[PDB]
Structure formats: C-alpha cells, structure tokens
Write a protein that binds this DNA or RNA. Structure first.
Lengths: 56, 103, 142, 15, 150, 117, 110
RNA sequence: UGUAACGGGGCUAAACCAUGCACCGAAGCUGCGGCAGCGACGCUUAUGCGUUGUUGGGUAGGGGAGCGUUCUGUAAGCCUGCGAAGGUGUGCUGUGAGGCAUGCUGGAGGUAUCAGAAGUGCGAAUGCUGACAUAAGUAACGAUAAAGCGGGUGAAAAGCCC
RNA sequence: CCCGGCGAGGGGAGUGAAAAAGAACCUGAAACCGUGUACGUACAAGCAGUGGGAGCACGCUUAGGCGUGUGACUGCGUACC
C-alpha cells in the first residue's frame, strides 16, 4: 500500500517517458477557402470538402 | 639506450633526455647527481645485464625540482564504535632529469 | 612511471584451429580459456580482451576419463514452477555436441561483460570443416 | 492537525 | 516563558514525539535551558597583589621612558585651547595627566580632549598607566604615590 | 553572548558537498547522504591504497609469466634462475621490459636459464 | 535579438504545461500556432496566448520578420503554491496545493 | 522452490601417502622518504640536534595540545563606495579542526596581534518551526431524481438568461 | 505604445547610481523543480563508492605533455547512529 523508499527523479522520469503528448502534423488545407482544419472535420468558417456545409 | 637504475626504495626505467620523479634526496636544486647503481643497460641489441650492477656504468642526471606531491586524505573510521580520525599527507618528491647514460 | 595497459582498439588478435578428437575436456577447455582471456600474450590486460579467436573442430569427439561419459550430469533449471532438467554426457553429445565445450569454457572464463565478450570469440563446430577459411586460421597444436 | 483513531486492539489473553 | 503548563498531546497513541510542555527548550517560541541571570563579574584582588602590580607597572614605565616627572602642572584658565597649546610644546599628544591635587581649572580643560585624562593622586588605576602612551608626574604627586604604595 | 551558527554550519556542509561532487542521486545533494558517502569513499581510499600495491604486483607477475612461457620457462623457474644469477630487477621493470623490448627479455631468460642449469 | 516573453503566476501546475511546451520547442511560429490551435489542453491555450504575445513583441518593440521566426528556447518554471485545506474523513484535514507556474517563451529569428 | 554435502568450471591426477626444490601469498618483515611521543646521549643549554634506542589499532574512560564563531579592551588604531559583511566558484596551503589570495553578485560595514567571557561548533532524541519532494498527475470531484435541443450574452457556454 | 478578455500577466519607453532595486520590492543560501551544453547509457544484476583504466569533448603553453568534465571495462567493496 505504501512505499519503503522514495522513488528518485530517474524512476519518476522514466515513468513519464510515455506521458509525452503527440502532435497532429496532418493539417489539411481546404479545397475552396484554403483554410487549415483537421481531417474529416469542418473548418472554423464552416467549410467541408469545398462546400459551405453549415451556412452559418 | 634506455637504462635501469636503483633509487630511494624503487627502480626506474629511464632514458637520456627524459625526466623522472623519485623520492626526496638531500641534493641542491642546481647541482647534478650520479647514479652508479645501474642494473641493466640495453642499447638496441647491445644489452648489458648487471650482476648485480653493470661494470663501469653510471647515470649522470640533473635535478630540477624538490616540491611536494598531491594531498591525500587518510580517513580512519570505525562504524558504531564512536571512532573517526582525519589526516592529510603530502609526500616529498624530486624531479630528476636524466642527462647522461654511460655504457 | 605508469605501467603499460593494452588499448582495445590497438590489440592484435589471431585465429587458431584446434582439434578436439581424443582430447580431455578439462585439459582442452582450460587452454582455450587461457588463449581467449589473453594470458599467453606479454601485453595482457585484466580489463581488456586481448585474447585470440579459437575455432574448435570435432566437438563430439571430445573424450572424458573414467565413467564420466554416462555419469557427468549437466543440470540446468528453466526458471519455472518445477522446471529442473538434467542430462548426461552421452545424451548431451548426441543432442548438442557444440554445447559441451561452451559450458566448460564459460565456467572457466571470468564472469561479467568482459567474460561474455571473450566468450563470443570461441567458434565451435561438430564437424571437422568450418566456414571461416577467409580469416586464415592457423593450426594450434594443443 | 488531528491524530488518528489508533489501530483497533486485539482481545488480550492471560496465563 | 509566558505560556501554559498543559501537555500538548497524549503521551501515547499519537504518532508525534513525546512532549509535556510547549515551553520546552527544544521548541520554538520559548527555550533557553540555562538562562542567564544578573550576576557579578568582579573578582577579588589582594592588597599586596594590587599594590605589587602597580609598583611593577611603574617600574616598567621608567624602563620604557614613558614617565615624565615635572615640578608643577596647572593652567591659568579652564580653556581647552591653552591646555592643547601646553602639551604640544612639550611634544605630547596622548598622555595621562595625573597630579597630586585635582583642581577644577585643569579638570574642565581636559574634559573635551579625547587623548588626555585628569585624575587625583589617590585615584590611580593600572589600565590607564598602560593604555596611554605617556604618563606625566607633578612633583608632589610622586611623594603622594610613593607612600600610598610603600 | 548569543552565537548564531549560520555561516559556520553552511560552510561546513559546503565543504562536504564539495568532496561529494560527482556522486549519484542524493549522495551529492543531500548533506546527510553525502557525508556518509565521503566517509565511505575515504575508507575505500585508505583500503585501496594497499590493494593498489597488490593488484599491480600480481599484474606484473602475469606479464612476466606470459612472456617467460613464450620463451619456454615457467615463472617459478624464471625468478629462481634470476635469483641464482644475482639479478635484482624487480617485477615492475621486468613487466615493462617484456612488453616493449622482446629482445632484452630473451637475454634475461637465457641468463636465468644458464644460472638454473 | 531574443525578445523574451513570459506569463508568471499561471493557474496550472508546471508538469501539465511542460507536456504542451515540449511540442513547440524548436519550431516555426507558423507551425507552432497551428499545433497549439488543435491541441486540446488547458495549457495549450495558455502558452498560445504567450506565443502570440511573443510574436507581437518581436514586431512592435523591436525587429521584424514574423515568418522567419523560430521558437528556440521554451521552459516552464514552477511558481508559488497557494495552499488550501481539504476537509477529509474522520475529522482530519489534508492540505492541498493550488500549484502555479511561470511559462517563459523566448523566440528569435535564428 | 533449484543442481545445492569440491566455492564453480572441471579433474583419473588437477584425488590420497612419503621426500625434495622453487614460486605466489598480509597493512607481517626488509628498502626509501616524511610526522609525532618517550627514555638516554656528545654537549647544546629556555635549544635544535651528526644523534641514539624504542614506540605510535583502540571502546568506555583519563591526560595533554590545538582550530573556528559572538562580544569586550587593545581600538576615535587599521581596511573599506577605485566596493565591507554575506553568498557563489577557482587556485594555493597546514597532520588536522581550518587559513590566504582572488573572478562574479552584493552593497555598507568589518577588524590585525595579544588577553578575557560563552546562549561557542548538530545527523540522528517516533526532536520543534518554516519551505519543498514522494507516492502521482494516482484515488476522488461527496446519494444512479436525468437530462436533450434552439436562440441570446460574452474572448470563451454542458453548468448563466430565455 | 503593443499583445492580451477596456483582464491577469508580459515586452518596449521613461524615472532612478542600480528595476540580475517594480511594490510578492536590500542581500536571495540549501532542499526541490527546470532549459541548454559535454560525455556515458537500451545484453547488462546488488550500500552505487574506491584503485586501475581505453575512448570522447574541451583549456593551454608547448610542438613534449598536463588539467577539467564524462567515463566503457575491471579487482575490491552488504549505509550512519
């Protein structure tokens, strides 16, 4: 339940080796408006695959 | 041309031109020193093995320094017995430069 | 001055071929361990692998005195719940003839990364024909 | 800063 | 220490160390086991030891030619300017003015000068005969300090 | 006269941590652990000052015994032959002779072989 | 030209922000802003506000060349801890730390 | 629990008996240099010695000799805004506690030598106070009555308004 | 003045001997947490040090070699009270 000796910075650091975040690195430019967005996601303006899908 | 002689408790393999660090002698800084206790003289397939010493061989060397060595920390410790002793030491040395190897 | 210590990048290793036909296992593997460790060279360094490569042939032709051919049991444990296994000398020769010298040499070798490094230079072959003719291995009469 | 309920004691024996 | 004599926590049960009072010296806000008291540091000196030391001090003064005996020492006015004019003519700057009779005319003139001090012949002490570089005697002070030491 | 032990205690801990530089983990930052490490290192330094004279001597013996057997003589007979030949060259020089100049060691082996035989 | 730009007393632990800050170390400001736009962390919008503040300081206070601008050094240093009391069971108290951090972003052109 | 009654490899001599000669082998002994204690010593003389002999593992404990800090006299003297103390590094130095010089910060106090007085030297006491780690970004986010959508506000709306 | 939510915070400018004196404000130690640089480290078992020691990176006069930092491998080595 409790530890007998405290973990070091090594044991803490080697545990956090897999806690690093992952980048997206796959930004897709829009077909018509040419704005960056995620794959299979609409843009902030409301464009998806060139069509103004949201009209809002 | 490298020769082997005896010194203050140890032997050295020295050659003419190089310098060697050995134990402190009572020699002035500027005068020369002669080592007649040569043990072996090898001159490039001309070898001489003294028994015990080489007959007619002497090393005419020249002293350059008489300083003290590095400080070593002697630590005496006895666990759970309330004993601990600290002591330092700087051994005296003498830098000796070999200037002459007589066959 | 400071005594000589052999540099690992400047060592001069050699290739040797010995024949294990009619040889006593202890008397042979010890000499192989001596050459692998580098105790025969005047430039021996305890922390530097200065030995030579050894190619031993006829691994199954090694001989043992007395009744050790059927009574020398080679124990090894699998690390499991009840996995202790044993094999005699006669059985191990038929199954893994090359493993007899390797275990005998490794126990005669120092333990550690350096001892494992010098064990890599021991080439064992059950037959009398090896595939290391490219290194020009000379015959070692021992 | 409060203490703790203390470990529950076992039934004490005798001779 | 202004505080309570109440036990902080229980003797057992708690995981804390054993404590009986918050005024303990191993605690903050109160401590000092062996606290000082107003005491007397003066130590007794024998009469022959005190008189013997003064005679040995005066004997070393004439060996280091620091004792200057004169027939008289008195200023006409209590002004410190004319007293500072006086000892400068005899090439003295840091002296102990000791006279047989302490006159207020000389007492006032040496009150502001740091390096001089005026005393009465009966009121001599060892430290001023040592701290000051030179010491000057008038004629009748020598005959009064001779009998008081004997 | 209250004496504040601030400057003296900090300088005492800094001296210990200065000697403990290079140690792993808390043995170079924590004064409690470093002081044990420095004392243990000082004990090892005193101990290994004797083992250095042992390890080097047995190293030279291995050097001599290796080169002597290359010339066809055991170490036990080589030192005995050198002793009978009135030769006082120590194992430190003899190990360095065999490493560098193989020619001089062969003359020393032949000198010890003539005295032994 | 260095143009340091930091945000002290950020309401977040330094451990959580260092995960975000490690993503944009050694990257162009154009790519770093795009990375921080689609990163779903609270520290992602925290350091994005510092980064755009660092970009604006690199054009108004001194220098030029916004497109040729690289985030060379970035680090998160822990700040003061605001300490509260969390009432726990059995009448005992466990003291919690509202950990803060100092997000320092320095971006140059070389 | 696993060979597990040569340390292991392994050994028919690398096992046992007798003999001999070598070698390894301790901080033991010898060689060199250095320090200290004690007893003698030719004669030096409040002292070093060409010396000479011998000693120097150590708990409790006893004896002897020292280092460092604060304050006081020394000392209205000395250093110091061309930079004190403290802090942080380096190079020397003594057997040692330590000391000297100096790079940087710092900014106005410190203090020679010789004496005196201690609130005079912290690793431990489940020691006290304050700060920061640890487990760990883990449990948990506090009745399983339940939320879903649209519009508005706002930098940002699952929790605000309709 | 600019970024930022007419925020918080920061960067410029200015005052100031000094803003590594900005109100959390003289001096800012250690524990602890970081970033950069040099080396080692993903086949190698243990009080994590010590003796030896190759390699690498620098700092130098010398053109021979020392020093600093890391340190493969290796004998020895089971913390303090």
């Amino acid at each position: 339940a409790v530890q007998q000796n405290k973990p070091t910075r090594s044991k803490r650091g080697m545990r956090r080796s897999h806690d690093a975040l992952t980048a997206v690195t796959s930004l897709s430019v829009d077909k018509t408006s040419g704005e960056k967005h995620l794959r299979h996601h609409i843009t902030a303006d409301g464009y998806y695959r060139g069509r103004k899908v949201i009209a809002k | 041309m490298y020769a082997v002689f005896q010194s203050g408790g140890k032997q050295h393999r020295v050659s003419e031109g190089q310098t060697v660090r050995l134990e402190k002698l009572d020699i002035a800084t500027g005068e020369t020193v002669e080592f007649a206790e040569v043990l072996m003289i090898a001159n490039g397939e001309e070898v001489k093995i003294g028994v015990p010493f080489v007959d007619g061989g002497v090393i005419k060397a020249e002293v350059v320094a008489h300083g003290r060595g590095e400080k070593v920390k002697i630590v005496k410790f006895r666990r759970r017995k309330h004993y601990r002793k600290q002591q330092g030491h700087r051994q005296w040395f003498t830098d000796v430069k070999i200037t002459g190897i007589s066959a | 001055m400071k005594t000589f210590t052999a540099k690992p990048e400047t060592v001069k290793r050699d290739w040797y071929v010995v024949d294990a036909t009619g040889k006593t296992l202890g008397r042979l593997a010890t000499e192989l361990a001596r050459r692998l460790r580098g105790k025969h060279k005047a430039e021996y360094t305890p922390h530097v692998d200065t030995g030579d490569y050894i190619i031993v042939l006829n691994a199954d032709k090694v001989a043992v005195t007395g009744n050790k051919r059927t009574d020398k049991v080679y124990y090894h444990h699998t690390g499991h719940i009840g996995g202790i296994k044993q094999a005699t000398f006669e059985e191990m020769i038929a199954r893994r003839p090359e493993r007899v010298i390797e275990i005998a040499v490794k126990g005669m070798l120092p333990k550690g990364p350096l001892g494992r490094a010098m064990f890599r230079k021991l080439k064992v072959y059950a037959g009398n024909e090896h595939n290391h003719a490219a290194q020009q291995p000379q015959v070692l009469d021992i | 800063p409060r203490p703790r309920p203390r470990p529950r004691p076992r039934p004490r024996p005798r001779p | 220490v202004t505080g309570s004599g109440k036990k902080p926590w229980r003797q057992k049960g708690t995981g804390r160390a054993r404590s009986g009072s918050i005024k303990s010296p191993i605690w903050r806000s109160g401590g000092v086991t062996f606290a000082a008291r107003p005491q007397d540091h003066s130590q007794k000196v024998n009469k022959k030891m005190y008189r013997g030391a003064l005679k040995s001090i005066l004997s070393e003064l004439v060996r280091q030619d620091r004792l200057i005996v004169v027939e008289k020492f008195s200023v006409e006015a209590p002004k410190t300017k004319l007293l500072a004019q006086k000892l400068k003519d005899m090439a003295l700057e840091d002296v102990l003015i000791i006279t047989g009779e302490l006159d207020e005319n000389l007492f006032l003139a040496a009150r502001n000068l740091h390096k001089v001090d005026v005393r009465d012949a009966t009121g001599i002490d060892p430290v001023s005969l040592i701290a000051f570089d030179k010491v000057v005697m008038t004629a009748d002070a020598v005959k009064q300090v001779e009998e008081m030491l004997a | 006269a209250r004496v504040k032990r601030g400057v003296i205690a900090r300088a005492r801990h800094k001296k210990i941590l200065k000697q403990a530089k290079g140690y792993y983990g808390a043995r170079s930052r924590v004064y409690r652990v470093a002081f044990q490490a420095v004392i243990k290192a000082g004990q090892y330094a005193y101990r290994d000052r004797r083992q250095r004279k042992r390890q080097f001597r047995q190293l030279w013996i291995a050097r001599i015994n290796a080169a002597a057997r290359q010339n066809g003589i055991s170490y036990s007979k080589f030192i005995n032959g050198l002793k009978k030949a009135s030769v006082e060259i120590d194992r430190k020089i003899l190990a360095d002779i065999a490493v560098f100049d193989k020619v001089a060691f062969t003359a020393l082996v032949e000198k010890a072989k003539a005295a032994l035989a | 030209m260095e143009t340091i730009a930091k945000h002290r007393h950020a309401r977040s632990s330094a451990q959580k922000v260092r995960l975000v800050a490690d993503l944009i170390r050694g990257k162009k400001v154009s790519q770093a802003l795009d990375i921080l736009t689609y990163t779903n962390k609270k520290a992602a919008v925290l350091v994005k506000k510092v980064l755009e503040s660092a970009i604006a300081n690199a054009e108004h206070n001194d220098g030029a060349d916004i497109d040729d601008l690289k985030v060379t050094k970035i680090f998160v240093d822990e700040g003061p801890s605001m300490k509260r009391i969390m009432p726990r069971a059995k009448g005992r108290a466990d003291r919690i730390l509202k950990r803060t951090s100092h997000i320092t972003v320095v971006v140059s052109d070389r």
